[PDB]
Amino acid sequence: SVIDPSELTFVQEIGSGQFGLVHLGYWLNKDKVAIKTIEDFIEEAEVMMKLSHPKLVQLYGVCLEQAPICLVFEFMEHGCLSDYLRTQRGLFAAETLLGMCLDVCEGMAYLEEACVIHRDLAARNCLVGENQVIKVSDFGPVKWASPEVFSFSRYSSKSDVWSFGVLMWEVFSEGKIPYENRSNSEVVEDISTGFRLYKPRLASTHVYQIMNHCWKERPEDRPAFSRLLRQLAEIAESG
Numbered sequence: 001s002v003i004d005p006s007e008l009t010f011v012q013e014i015g016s017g018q019f020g021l022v023h024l025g026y027w028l029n030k031d032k033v034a035i036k037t038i039e040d041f042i043e044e045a046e047v048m049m050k051l052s053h054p055k056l057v058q059l060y061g062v063c064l065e066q067a068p069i070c071l072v073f074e075f076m077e078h079g080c081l082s083d084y085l086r087t088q089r090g091l092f093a094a095e096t097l098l099g100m101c102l103d104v105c106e107g108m109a110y111l112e113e114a115c116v117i118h119r120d121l122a123a124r125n126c127l128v129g130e131n132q133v134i135k136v137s138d139f140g141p142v143k144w145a146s147p148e149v150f151s152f153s154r155y156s157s158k159s160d161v162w163s164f165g166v167l168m169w170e171v172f173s174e175g176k177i178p179y180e181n182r183s184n185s186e187v188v189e190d191i192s193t194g195f196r197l198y199k200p201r202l203a204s205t206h207v208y209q210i211m212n213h214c215w216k217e218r219p220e221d222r223p224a225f226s227r228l229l230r231q232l233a234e235i236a237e238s239g
């Protein structure tokens with residue numbers, strides 16, 4: 001990786017060793033970024049900056065000089081996970097797909113520890129980066145919602161766990177639509193009666209046990225993200 005001189009600006013000398021005269025300098029980098037378009041949200045920005053984790057799409061800064069207000073995010077080379085899964089359908093190995101769920105779970109456990117509620121955990125809100133890394137984004141509809149969320153809008157990290165079980169299904173079914181030909185009213189009726197998304201072929205019986213655990217009616221009966229992280233980390237390293 002060669003650096004063109006134009007990109008470099010020398011400032012001052014910062015001491016000297018025997019093999020190398022050191023200089024403090026400014027490096028002008030032309031890095032790719034993703035820019036989201038729109039006191040009000042100024043307070044939300046400085047907080048999102050503190051939320052730094054390798055499995056979360058990083059916020060770099062905000063642009064406030066009038067016109068549409070910008071938000072500078074980390075660029076994710078391969079786009080959204082939902083589209084990524086759909087185009088490579090029938091091409092994935094079960095180990096690749098468990099690795100994607102572990103990636104999401106790592107970021108979610110950090111958000112749980114930080115006391116941050118996602119409210120929209122779905123494959124479409126997750127992004128694919130370098131070496132098939134999955135990072136969580138859009139942290140600040142019924143298909144992913146738990147009974148307390150669709151019925152009363154009672155958000156908690158345990159409702160994010162319900163959403164995560166739906167995500168795991170999307171991943172293991174290689175980006176299929178949950179409750180495909182059902183309406184938002186039909187879905188509510190189905191879950192309430194006790195219906196659950198079927199076991200996809202690429203998901204082992206143990207992975208499907210985890211999915212149903214995320215889908216228990218009582219939020220207090222669902223595992224925490226910290227519990228899920230240890231669980232999926234063991235299945236990944238053992239096989």
Ligand SMILES: CN(C)CC[C@@H](c1ccccc1)n1cc(NC(=O)c2n[nH]c3cc(-c4cn[nH]c4)ccc23)cn1
Nearest residue numbers: 034036057073074075076077078079080127137138139
């Ligand atoms: C088809 N696809 C596989 C290729 C598209 C790829 C691309 C690469 C280079 C140039 C153009 C397009 N692609 C990469 C992205 N990356 C992102 O979309 C992205 N990268 N970082 C993001 C952050 C947010 C975000 C919104 N709210 N919070 C975070 C939303 C989206 C993103 C999208 N398409």
